[PDB]
Symmetry: C2
C-alpha cells in the first residue's frame, strides 16, 4: 500500500485526461508531466513512483487505464 | 537515491530542532511530526519514508544526528 494511493492518483489523472488510444509516446509525455498535477503533498512521491514503474506503466496503459486495476496489476496496490 | 533527499531533509530538521540527548520518546514524537515541516512536495514521500525506517531511525538518532551520515548508515543514501 506504500505507493498505492499515489498510483491510483497518477493513473487516475491519465485516464481522465488521455484518450484510450494514445501511443506509447503520448503516455510517456503525459507520465513525465503527470506528477506536477497532483496535489502538492504527492509530487515528490509521485515522480519517484513514476521513475520506478514507468516501463510497466507504459506497457500496461496502452491496454487499460482503469486506475484501480492498473495499480493492482503492476503491484503498487497489494 | 530513492528516499535519499527526503531522508537528508527529515533528519536535517531533527538535527536542527532536537538536542543531541533526546530520549527515544522525544525522537518518536519529533519523527511523527517531522514530515509536515518539510516543503509541500515532500510531505507524502516523507511520511512513507518515516513509516518504513522509523525503528532504525530511532535506534540511530539516539547516537548521532548528522543527516548526511544517518541516511548513509540506514541505507537510504547509497
Amino acid at each position: 500500500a506504500g505507493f498505492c494511493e499515489v498510483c491510483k492518483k497518477l493513473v487516475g489523472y491519465l485516464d481522465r485526461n488521455l484518450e484510450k488510444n494514445s501511443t506509447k509516446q503520448e503516455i510517456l509525455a503525459a507520465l513525465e508531466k503527470g506528477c506536477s498535477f497532483l496535489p502538492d503533498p504527492y509530487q515528490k512521491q509521485c515522480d519517484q513512483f513514476v521513475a520506478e514503474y514507468e516501463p510497466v506503466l507504459i506497457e500496461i496503459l496502452v491496454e487499460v487505464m482503469d486506475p484501480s486495476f492498473v495499480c493492482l496489476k503492476i503491484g503498487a496496490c497489494p
